[PDB]
Design a protein around this nucleic acid. Structure first.
Ligand SMILES: [Mg+2]
Ligand SMILES: [Mg+2]
Ligand SMILES: [Mg+2]
Ligand SMILES: [Mg+2]
Ligand SMILES: [Mg+2]
Ligand SMILES: [Mg+2]
Ligand SMILES: [Mg+2]
Ligand SMILES: [Mg+2]
Ligand SMILES: [Mg+2]
Ligand SMILES: [Mg+2]
Ligand SMILES: [Mg+2]
Ligand SMILES: [Mg+2]
Ligand SMILES: [Mg+2]
Ligand SMILES: [Mg+2]
Ligand SMILES: [Mg+2]
Ligand SMILES: [Mg+2]
Ligand SMILES: [Mg+2]
Ligand SMILES: [Zn+2]
Ligand SMILES: [Zn+2]
Lengths: 87, 120, 25, 97, 81, 206, 129, 217, 96
RNA sequence: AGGGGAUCGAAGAUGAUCAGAUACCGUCGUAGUCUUAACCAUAAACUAUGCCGACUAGGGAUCGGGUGGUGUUUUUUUAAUGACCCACUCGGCACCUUACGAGAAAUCAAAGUCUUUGGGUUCUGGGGGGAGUAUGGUCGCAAGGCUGAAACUUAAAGGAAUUG
């Protein structure tokens, strides 16, 4: 939210649900951010380095947290099958 | 009725928590402990207390008592931990269902077979 | 008083005014 | 306000049932609102059964109960029979025992 | 649920649905060629006949009507198309 | 991103089928599960263990990722999981909660039960719902062992299981632990059946 | 009986978004639905959409992103007198800097900003933001 | 002395988190009031209303006191706390703290041109609580706060310069009205305009970057 | 839509319906029925001048106990009779 | 207006009860209760919730219809039937669990998709009394139905829930 002349104004640009791209606001204390570990050759899990996803309180309440994570991580490569885009 | 108030039952807890070494199945010495190690305004209230920190001690020696945990249990429990020498690959092969093996066939590789059927 | 007896009260009352007024038709 | 979804008692998809007469006070009450018990009991009783067979021809006989349905009227159902009056939640419970 | 392919439904879950609730609608009744070896030809019956379809030449029967699928007459045979 | 040898091996598969970790819930069957695989007739639904295995891996791949391994929390109010969780927490970092939960453990700093983790693992979101609820008052992600009739609100990444008892829950936890150690960790190489017995995890007696 | 075929198409889209979905089937589509769908799309408020041809009135699959608060229809298609356009946008848009009143005019189905630029007016269809 | 309990209280006292915008960035649940004291010290309070309530009891009437309180700077951080104790001051004390805990952010915008420093709202917003709906509408400069004394004061401490308001409901019940106005300005950072359509990489959580530098003992 | 027409040509129905329902307005109906001019001791006018017939001592309603000094007045343009209050302490002594 | 008139039974008369008891309880029992031909048009005529259309969420029962099965059971010689079991699908009468959502709440798959306020349409309400009264019209054999005011009076009447 820029201003008159190029200057960035209004503090704080909120995160977004990786799943629904809606804002995750402050009092949304039911939301979640899953850090998933980048790993290297022959197991081993490279500490401090994650593939990360966020998830709105809405979504988790509606029980869609597990299906939605599935699709998300799989089209990154951390799942191999499991999720069908058809029904 | 001789049901002990909370002040007594609470003080026993607190004592058995943090002085379990010292304290004994014996009231008489549990009595004396409570003087040196705690401040109580009446002989009667201390007796009352020591008699019950004694009771709690006596049945601890025969299995835990909920409320009181001096950590030492949780580590006796972790060392009191092991079993097995058999496991549950004998004998022969894994007995499966028609579709259990379909799951096998359609996903993976080699597994010993053993068909079933079942009805209504 | 119970609504229905009051409804009955005024039914009675109308039949009365209905009467008295006919004395002068 | 409204105090039950069954309202009085049990009538959704009709409009009019048909009154029964209360077994105790004779009060008419719709059949679906009735409140009912099967009075099944032996003709004899706890005591007479021994004394029954004893002073009888036949080996132990057979024995027949009496089977008759009861229709109570809420007031009559409350005043003695099946009633208590239950808490706001217990009222929901349709399980018998 | 929450994200799925409305454009490419699985054939199975498309198969269980109602005929007007598939993606594009079509019937689920078939036609058949039907014959009783007394004769040498093949009449074509509709799987839900309503009319008690009488054979070409011989007043025989072929299928009685029902609630839905016509019941074909006991000693016969058929193919779908 | 796929590891390469982290495919489901025939030794793990045998472990699982003997554990009946594929024998899913009967008539009951929560809409939110295509972890299924062909209705075995007369009630039982068969659970696709491949998917099971991957989830477990992703699970482990998120557990190891927590900086301090001891603010990973394991839960199990069901007796059939108490020996497991203690044995999971034993080997890895992880603080355990076996038996009764005690509400106010995540809200309410004032309690003596007070935890405050960065992740929660749970064995049966029916029995342990106290915790699943509690954690979504306060932004904790949740990993959970789920059958075909488990609630799935407020639990990300389900591990399709068989909380019908026995060895399943014990297996899954053992496999969980086994993988979090094979990850940035105190283990080994390829096959490597691991020293520790899988029957170590398991409800006792009688 | 179906009075506004547009009205169903918007409320469908609206209920999808609200429930966190990423697509909707809509039925039965129309020239007008398409053009309304087209405007929203041009402005980012939905993704791509596909017209499936039942041999009938059409179905549509919309793919929506989640930038969408509301897409509403205006039930009588009131005439707007080009000067009245200000009064509509104000009545029913969240601020003066984003969001659109979309409406039907002799020069095509177009949002009010294009309407302003082309200097035409007409009747009011609905809105997006 | 402070002695924080909670991970967040430690990280904050230990100078590892500098502003609540971070807290809101990651939606960190706040339990310790001292947190929002050190993180935002220009906070000035304001008792909004005090009223007697009464409870009937199996041995006495019980009339304790309900106090409604607003804290804020005048720079996009409000807090609305409601507390009832049996002495007035104790109600106010506990009320100010609750109000500090609930301190939320305000997105303010421009009535409709880019100029110098936001002065109004991003969008219209609505807040409901009970029967009352407080509705907030962006206004041109020097319009002022067009609102009742109470709601105006909550909107000033919140940092807003010009806004329009409309209310529906039994607005005389102050508790519900302010709560609705609160929820109304709370809603401004939930509303997705296109200026916020741009994708952000997804920041890492302080609770993990200073993982060690938090931690119990 | 619950209950009003929404159509583009339902303007008449919408006006009539309003007209019909204005009669539930207490002020509106008095305005059009001409209640002022018809009943009501003044014409509909702000004041009226009358003649003092007798001095009354009206006993006050509960929970109040008092004698409220008043006057019966016959309106000049009217002959309509009216009782009126005589405000403040004494002041009944000022009439006759 | 005819028939019928077992039963129960407004009215009436009685026995008790009661300070009284025109009642509650008991007895006698007229009309009535049933039927034909005609009237009447009202019920808390109730889900106190207009109709048509769309969309939004889970579960097990059940009624009707249909489809699928090397299902069960019926024996005869296997079938065909039938009844039953499983899966699905239309359309019903309902219940369960949830609530994204709604509400003043009780509660509600509508009472949701509403100040981010518009799918179509019918109807009714606008503080409480006065009063469903007065008056006119109209229908009715009657009882009464429909339509339906004001003057004046009044600061509350009222709803849901909470504690006593
Ligand atoms: Mg005469
Ligand atoms: Mg009440
Ligand atoms: Mg009542
Ligand atoms: Mg009826
Ligand atoms: Mg005041
Ligand atoms: Mg009226
Ligand atoms: Mg006089
Ligand atoms: Mg008779
Ligand atoms: Mg009598
Ligand atoms: Mg007498
Ligand atoms: Mg009499
Ligand atoms: Mg009526
Ligand atoms: Mg009813
Ligand atoms: Mg349903
Ligand atoms: Mg069949
Ligand atoms: Mg008064
Ligand atoms: Mg009460
Ligand atoms: Zn009775
Ligand atoms: Zn033939």
């Amino acid at each position: 939210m820029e201003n008159d002349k190029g200057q960035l104004v209004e503090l704080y640009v909120p995160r977004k649900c990786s799943a629904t791209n809606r804002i995750i606001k402050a009092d949304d204390h039911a939301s979640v951010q899953i850090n998933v570990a980048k790993v290297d050759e022959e197991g081993r899990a490279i500490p401090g380095e994650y593939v990360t996803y966020a998830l709105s309180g809405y979504v988790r309440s509606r029980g869609e947290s597990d299906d939605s994570l599935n699709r998300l991580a799989q089209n990154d490569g951390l799942l191999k099958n499991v999720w069908s885009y058809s029904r | 009725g001789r049901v002990r108030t909370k002040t007594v039952k609470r003080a026993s807890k607190a004592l058995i928590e943090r002085y379990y070494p010292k304290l004994t199945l014996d009231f008489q010495t549990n009595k004396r402990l409570c003087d040196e190690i705690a401040t109580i305004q009446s002989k009667r209230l201390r007796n009352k207390i020591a008699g019950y920190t004694t009771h709690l001690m006596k049945r601890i020696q025969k299995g835990p008592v909920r409320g009181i945990s001096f950590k030492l249990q949780e580590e006796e429990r972790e060392r009191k931990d092991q079993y097995v020498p058999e496991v549950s690959r004998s004998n022969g092969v894994l007995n499966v269902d028609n579709q259990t093996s379909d799951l096998v066939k359609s996903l993976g590789l080699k597994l010993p077979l053993s068909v079933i059927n079942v009805s209504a | 008083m119970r609504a229905k007896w009051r409804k009955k009260r005024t039914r009675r009352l109308k039949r009365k005014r209905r009467k008295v007024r006919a004395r002068s038709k | 306000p409204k105090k039950r979804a069954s309202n009085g008692r049990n009538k959704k998809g009709r409009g009019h049932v048909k009154p029964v007469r209360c077994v105790n006070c004779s009060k008419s009450i719709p059949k679906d609102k009735a409140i009912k018990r099967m009075a099944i009991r032996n003709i004899v009783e706890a005591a007479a059964v021994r004394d029954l067979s004893e002073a009888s021809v036949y080996p132990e006989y057979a024995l027949p109960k009496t089977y008759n349905k009861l229709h109570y009227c809420v007031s009559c159902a409350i005043h003695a029979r099946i009633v208590r009056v239950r808490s706001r939640e217990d009222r929901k419970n349709r399980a018998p025992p | 649920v929450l994200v799925q392919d409305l454009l490419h439904p699985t054939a199975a879950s498309e198969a269980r649905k109602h005929k007007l609730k598939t993606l594009v609608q079509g019937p689920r009744s078939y036609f058949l060629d039907v014959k009783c070896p007394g004769c040498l030809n093949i009449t074509t019956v509709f799987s839900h006949a309503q009319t008690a379809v009488t054979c070409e030449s011989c007043s025989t029967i072929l299928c009685t009507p029902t609630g839905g699928k016509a019941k074909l007459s006991e000693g016969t045979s058929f193919r779908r198309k | 991103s796929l590891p390469a040898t982290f495919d489901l091996t025939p030794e793990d598969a045998q472990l699982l089928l003997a554990a009946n970790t594929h024998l899913g819930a009967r008539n009951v069957q929560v809409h939110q599960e295509p972890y299924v695989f062909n209705a075995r007739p007369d009630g039982v639904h068969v659970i696709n263990v491949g998917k099971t295995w991957e989830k477990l891996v992703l699970a482990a791949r998120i557990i190891a990722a927590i900086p301090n391994p001891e603010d990973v929390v394991a839960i199990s109010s069901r007796t059939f999981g108490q020996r497991a969780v203690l044995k999971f927490a034993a080997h890895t970092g992880a603080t355990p909660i076996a038996g009764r939960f005690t509400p106010g453990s995540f809200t309410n700093y004032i309690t003596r039960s007070f935890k405050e983790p960065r992740l929660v693992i749970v064995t049966d979101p029916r029995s342990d719902a106290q915790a699943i609820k509690e954690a979504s008052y306060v932004n904790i992600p949740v990993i959970a062992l789920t059958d075909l009739d488990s609630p799935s609100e407020f639990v990300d990444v389900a591990i399709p299981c068989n909380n019908r008892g026995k060895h399943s829950i014990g297996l899954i936890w053992y496999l969980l632990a086994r993988e979090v150690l094979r990850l940035r960790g105190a283990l080994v190489d390829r096959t490597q059946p691991w020293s520790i017995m899988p029957d170590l995890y398991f409800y006792r007696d009688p | 009986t179906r009075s506004s075929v547009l009205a169903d198409a918007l409320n469908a889209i609206n209920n999808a978004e609200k429930t966190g979905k990423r697509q909707v089937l809509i039925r039965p589509s129309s020239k007008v639905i398409i053009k309304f769908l087209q405007v929203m799309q041009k402005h980012g408020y939905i993704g791509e959409f596909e017209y499936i041809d039942d041999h009938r009135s059409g179905k549509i699959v919309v793919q929506l992103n989640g930038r969408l608060n509301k897409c509403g229809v205006i039930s009588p298609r009131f005439n707007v007198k080009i000067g009245d356009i200000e009064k509509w946008t104000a009545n029913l848009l969240p601020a003066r800097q984003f969001g659109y009143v979309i409406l039907t005019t002799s020069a095509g189905i177009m949002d009010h900003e294009e309407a302003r630029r082309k200097h035409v007016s007409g009747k009011i269809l609905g809105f997006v933001y | 002395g402070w002695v924080p309990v909670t991970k967040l209280g430690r990280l904050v006292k230990a100078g590892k988190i500098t502003t609540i915008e971070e807290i809101f960035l990651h939606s960190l649940p706040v339990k310790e009031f001292q947190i929002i004291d050190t993180l935002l010290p220009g906070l000035q309070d304001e008792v909004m209303n005090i009223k007697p309530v009464q409870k009937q009891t199996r041995a006495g009437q019980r009339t304790r006191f309900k106090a409604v309180v607003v804290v804020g700077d005048s720079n996009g951080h409000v807090g609305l706390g409601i507390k009832t104790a049996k002495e007035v001051a104790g109600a106010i004390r506990a009320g100010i703290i609750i109000a500090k805990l609930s301190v939320i952010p305000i997105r303010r915008g421009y009535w409709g041109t880019n100029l110098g420093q936001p002065h109004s709202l991003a969008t219209k917003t609505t807040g409901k609580c009970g029967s009352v709906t407080v509705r907030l509408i962006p206004a041109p400069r020097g319009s002022g706060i067009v609102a009742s004394p109470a709601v105006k004061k909550l909107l000033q401490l919140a940092g807003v310069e010009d806004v329009y308001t409309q209310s529906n409901g039994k607005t005389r019940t102050l508790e519900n009205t302010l709560k609705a106005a609160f929820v109304a300005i709370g809603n401004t950072y939930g509303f997705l305009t296109p200026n916020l359509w741009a994708e952000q990489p997804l920041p890492v959580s302080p609770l993990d970057i200073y993982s060690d530098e938090a931690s119990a003992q | 839509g619950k209950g009003k027409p929404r159509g583009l040509n339902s303007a008449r129905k919408l006006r009539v319906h309003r007209r019909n329902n204005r009669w539930a307005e207490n002020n509106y109906k008095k305005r059009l029925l001409g209640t002022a001019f018809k009943s009501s001791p003044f014409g509909g006018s702000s004041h009226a001048k009358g003649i003092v017939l007798e001095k009354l001592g009206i006993e006050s309603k509960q929970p109040n106990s008092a004698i409220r000094k008043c006057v019966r007045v016959q309106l000049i343009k009217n002959g309509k009779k009216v009782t009126a209050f005589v405000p403040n302490d004494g002041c009944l002594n000022f009439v006759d």
